[PDB]
Structures are given as structure tokens and as C-alpha cells.
UniProtKB/Swiss-Prot annotation, chain A:
Gene giving rise to this polypeptide: rpsO
Family label: Belongs to the universal ribosomal protein uS15 family.
GO cellular component: cytosolic small ribosomal subunit
Name of the protein in question: Small ribosomal subunit protein uS15
Gene3D superfamilies on file: 6.10.250.3130, S15/NS1, RNA-binding
Source species of the chain: Mycolicibacterium smegmatis (strain ATCC 700084 / mc(2)155)
SUPFAM superfamilies: S15/NS1 RNA-binding domain
GO biological process: translation
UniProtKB/Swiss-Prot annotation, chain B:
Residues of the full protein shown: 23 to 137 of 138
Annotated Gene Ontology cellular component terms: ribonucleoprotein complex; ribosome
Cysteine disulfide partners in this protein: none
The name this protein goes by in its record: Small ribosomal subunit protein uS11
GO BP terms, alphabetized: translation
Keywords: Ribonucleoprotein, Ribosomal protein, RNA-binding, rRNA-binding
Molecular function in Gene Ontology: rRNA binding; structural constituent of ribosome
Quaternary structure annotation from Swiss-Prot or TrEMBL: Part of the 30S ribosomal subunit. Interacts with proteins S7 and S18. Binds to IF-3.
Disordered: region residues: 97-115
Main function: Located on the platform of the 30S subunit, it bridges several disparate RNA helices of the 16S rRNA. Forms part of the Shine-Dalgarno cleft in the 70S ribosome.
From Swiss-Prot, chain C:
Protein name: Small ribosomal subunit protein bS18A
Similarity remark: Belongs to the bacterial ribosomal protein bS18 family.
GO molecular function, one term: structural constituent of ribosome
Record has Metal-binding as a keyword: no
Pfam families in UniProt: Ribosomal_S18 (PF01084)
InterPro entries reported in the protein's UniProt record: Ribosomal_bS18, Ribosomal_bS18_CS, Ribosomal_bS18_sf
Subunit structure: Part of the 30S ribosomal subunit. Forms a tight heterodimer with protein bS6.
Gene that encodes it: rpsR1
GO cellular component assignments: cytosolic small ribosomal subunit
Keywords from the UniProt entry: Ribonucleoprotein, Ribosomal protein, RNA-binding, rRNA-binding
Length: 88, 115, 84, 96
RNA sequence: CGCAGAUAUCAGGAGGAACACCGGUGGCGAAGGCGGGUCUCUGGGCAGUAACUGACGCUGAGGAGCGAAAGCGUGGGGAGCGAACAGGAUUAGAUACCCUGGUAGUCCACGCCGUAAACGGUGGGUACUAGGUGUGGGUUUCCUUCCUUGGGAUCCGUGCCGUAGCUA
């Protein structure tokens, strides 16, 4: 799972300042990290459906946050996107 | 030859009753059952069969040289203690009782229900 | 001098009774360990089986913790399980 | 590292003059991984609940460790593949 | 089935499914469902602090995914149970209950189908609306021993009784 160490790393890079958690940038970054790890897990475990549901939920809220940020400021949107390497 | 002290196994079920004498090691000397007593089919669940069977086997063990017995019981038996009374009537000393009816830890599937 | 209930006299008692009991935090304990079999032998019968909560008093937390310990103990033969 | 506490039971044919170094021969592999806290208890020659391979007693032993998952697994593997050990069981000291 | 030496009993070994007492109006899971034990990997929920963004929320045609059991396919394995099926017995006759036996199947891996009384026969989200009573979890203050179904308040989930209200 995610530790305080990893979270503070990601919040040091993507966090607006040292306190922010509600930053959509930070939130999206953490979710995508979590999802990369979980996908590595599901490489082996093709059958952990109870975990795949969590995966889908996280994808849902990820795209919601992206959708919010694009509603607000597409510059910031694509900055974050190119910064994380997503396709959307 | 002979053995002065040994052990006894008593298997009482719904449709039959049977006993066997044996050393504590596992070597039988003598046994009896309701089929050798003479009853047949459906009569031989009653405790009277237990009386007669245990009595005959105890006398056989008296013959082969037994005087004291360890007693081990097993199964649904209407006439367990009936057989016990028959044994202690036959002239034998009750060593130790234990109600080891074999219970499993939720293992092999039993059959279905009847009606 | 006083009754088991109608305890209008002392503070709210730090004592246990027949309905109420939390027997481990109460007394009879060092710590929940599958090592200490003399303690685990108290939550059984002579036939080796395990007690219930409305017999003992434990919370489900302690109950399940202790049962798991017991069961590990029977696996490592530190405790006489019921058998032949 | 993760803390663990291992149990082992052994035949009485061994002796307390052999117990500790015999195990440390294995546990050096872990000591050269973490500088791991090894801490042994020995309270053996103790009668059993029931016989394993017709042994009325065993030489119980408890082994506190702070190590890693791979190392505990490989330890278990070497011990179970050994000719001497009856049992071994592995339990985590921590919350889970 | 035995009378070619059974049943029983004992010593040992081989073996594969299910894992008593904990365990029940009790916990988790969106639903299906979920307990032998240990390790690994991972998910969700609850409470408190309420530091952070600042309405980003709810629903959702279509659509995708999961989904009891029985079934299907390739492979493996196969103790017990047991569709079919054979016999016995009852029966007016019994292709059925009952008895003896017993194949596919139940089990494992990988894929399929995608249904049920899949039921709380109550779609989801939200605010207010008399209470009492047990109960699981976590906070917290007082008689305070402060080792307590302590007691009270509070939050979440779960059952019983019961007002107004509502319903043929």
C-alpha cells in the first residue's frame, strides 16, 4: 500500500505547497500511483475481482477530477497530464 | 494359554449390537453377537440381545482365563448399560469406561434424508 | 452488607458478576500467547472442546483471538486435543 | 525489517549441547541479510499432546527475529527440507 | 456381502473432499456469497483531528464488467455421496419414495453460458418525523475502584416491541 513516505514524496513533487491534499494534481497523482501498483498485482492475480472493483472506482474518480480540471483551466489540465504521461 | 486382564469393545448401533474382548494391545480372545445368540433381522436392536450376547462373550472369556476387563463403548445404543450390567453379572471387574463414539471434525459427506 | 445489585453506595463497580464478565482483562492473564498452555486450558472442557461467550463472558475480540491461539496450539501439539 | 517469532519442535534424540549452534548454522544466512535480532528460548524434552512419528516428547524452541519475507520463507524451506525438524510455524509479532 | 476366512479389533502405510466444539437473529462483502491453520499481495468501511481543494455532487438510457448451482469443452484427479441405470421389497400396477450396488457429476487449472423464490418478494441518493429495548465497533466525561454489559452523552451498523401517520 501507500506509506506516509511515498505520499510526502508525491506531495513534494506535485503539491502546490507543502500542506495541500485537496489539490486535484496531488490526488490524481496518488491515485495513478496506486493504480500502477495494483495493475502490477493483477498481472499475477487475474482473479482478485474484489480488488478490481476498487480499481474501477479509482479510475472513475480519477476521470472525474480530470473532468473538473478541464472544466476550469485546460492549461493546468494538460500540464498535469503531460507531467504524468497519461493519454487523457 | 490365557490372559488375566484385558479390554472390551462394545459397538451398539440402531440395528445390531456386538462386543469383543481383547488385550490392551489389540489381540482378541473372544467375541459374540446377537446373530450367534440366535435372534435375526429386526429383533436384535433390543437390549435383551445385548444382555445375552455380552453374557456369552464374558463366559467365553472366563473360559479362556479373564477376570478383569477394560470397557470401551461406541455408538447409538439403547442397551449400553444393559450390556454393562450383563458383564458385571457374568463375574468380571470393570476397569475403565470411556464413551468414545467416533465424531468427525465435519469431514466426509453423510447420505441424504429419509421419509 | 450490600446486595449484588442496588449498588447505590460505592462508585460504579470495577467488579464482575454472573451476567457481566470480561474474564481476561479481569484476571487470570499474562498475555494472549499460544505458548502459555496452562492458561488456555482454562477456556475448555476436559473433553478439549471450547467454551462459548455466554459461558465465559469475553468480547468477540478476545474470544476469537483465544480460539485462534488454542487452534495453533493443537497444531503444534502443545495442548492435548480431543482424539484417540 | 518485519518482526517474527518462530516455533520449532525436534526429536529428543538431539541434545541441548547441539541445539543452538545447529540452528545458528541456518540463521547465519539471515544475520548476513539484516544484522537481525536473533533471540532464542530453549525449554525442551517436553512431553507432547500427541505423538508425531511415535515421539512422546519434543525439544521445543522459540526464535524471535526481525527480518524480511523472503528470508523467513527460505529459512522455513531449509528447515522443513532438513532431516531433523518435526514442525515449524511462523507467526508475526506485529499487529497483523 | 461372507463361510476361499467376513464383521469386529489392533499396528502401519497410501489416498482425496469437507474442515466439529469457536459459531448465533453475530462480523465483512455493492450483489452472489464468505470460516482448519500460517505467510505473502491487495481492497473496503468506521471513528476522531477536522490541517487541504472549494459544489468537483446524485442518477443513469444504451453499454461494459462481476455473478449461486446445475450444465459444456481441453487436461488432471477421483475416498465418500450419487442423476441415470441394475436388482430386491411394498404395490392392483410402481418406469417413485424404502434397501443393496453404482457411471456422468461433485473436486483442481483455463475458458464458456449468464440464468433462480439471484427475497427484505420493498431501486438509488437526501432532510425532518414519539419512544423504549437488547446487541457489534470506535470516541468521550462523572460516582471513580478509576483492574468496570460501570454509568451518561455521541457516531456507525444491526434486530424486537411500539405512537402519530399510512395502507383494500
Amino acid at each position: 500500500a501507500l506509506t506516509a513516505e511515498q505520499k510526502k514524496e508525491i506531495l513534494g513533487q506535485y503539491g502546490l505547497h507543502d500542506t495541500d491534499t485537496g489539490s486535484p494534481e496531488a490526488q490524481v497523482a496518488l491515485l495513478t500511483k496506486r493504480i500502477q501498483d495494483l495493475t502490477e498485482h493483477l498481472k499475477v492475480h487475474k482473479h482478485d475481482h474484489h480488488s478490481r472493483r476498487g480499481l474501477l472506482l479509482l479510475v472513475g474518480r480519477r476521470r472525474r477530477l480530470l473532468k473538473y480540471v478541464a472544466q476550469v483551466d485546460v492549461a493546468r489540465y494538460r500540464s498535469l497530464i503531460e507531467r504524468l504521461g497519461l493519454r487523457r | 494359554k490365557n490372559v488375566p486382564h484385558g479390554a472390551a469393545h462394545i459397538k451398539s448401533t440402531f440395528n445390531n449390537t456386538i462386543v469383543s474382548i481383547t488385550d490392551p494391545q489389540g489381540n482378541v480372545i473372544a467375541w459374540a453377537s446377537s446373530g450367534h445368540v440366535g435372534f435375526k433381522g429386526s429383533r436384535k436392536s433390543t437390549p435383551f440381545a445385548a444382555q445375552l450376547a455380552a453374557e456369552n462373550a464374558a463366559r467365553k472369556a472366563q473360559e479362556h482365563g479373564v477376570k478383569k476387563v477394560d470397557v470401551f463403548v461406541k455408538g447409538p445404543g439403547s442397551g449400553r448399560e444393559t450390556a454393562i450390567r450383563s458383564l458385571q453379572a457374568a463375574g468380571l471387574e470393570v476397569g475403565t469406561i470411556s464413551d468414545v463414539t467416533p465424531q468427525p471434525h465435519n469431514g466426509c459427506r453423510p447420505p441424504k434424508r429419509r421419509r | 452488607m450490600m446486595a449484588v445489585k442496588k449498588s447505590r453506595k460505592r462508585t460504579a463497580a470495577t467488579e464482575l458478576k454472573k451476567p457481566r464478565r470480561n474474564q481476561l482483562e479481569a484476571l487470570g492473564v499474562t498475555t494472549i500467547d499460544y505458548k502459555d498452555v496452562a492458561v488456555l486450558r482454562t477456556f475448555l472442557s476436559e473433553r478439549g472442546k471450547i467454551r462459548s461467550r455466554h459461558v465465559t463472558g469475553l468480547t468477540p475480540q478476545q474470544q476469537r483471538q483465544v480460539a485462534t491461539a488454542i487452534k495453533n496450539a493443537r497444531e503444534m501439539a502443545l495442548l492435548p486435543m480431543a482424539g484417540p | 525489517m518485519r518482526p517474527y517469532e518462530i516455533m520449532v519442535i525436534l526429536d529428543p534424540t538431539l541434545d541441548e549441547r547441539t541445539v543452538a549452534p545447529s540452528l545458528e548454522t541456518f540463521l547465519n544466512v539471515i544475520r548476513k541479510d539484516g544484522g537481525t535480532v536473533d533471540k532464542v528460548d530453549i525449554w525442551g524434552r517436553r512431553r507432547l499432546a500427541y505423538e508425531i512419528a511415535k515421539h512422546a516428547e519434543g525439544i521445543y524452541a522459540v526464535i524471535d527475529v526481525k527480518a524480511e519475507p523472503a528470508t523467513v520463507s527460505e529459512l522455513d524451506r531449509q528447515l522443513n527440507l532438513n532431516e531433523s525438524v518435526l514442525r515449524t510455524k511462523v507467526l508475526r509479532t506485529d499487529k497483523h
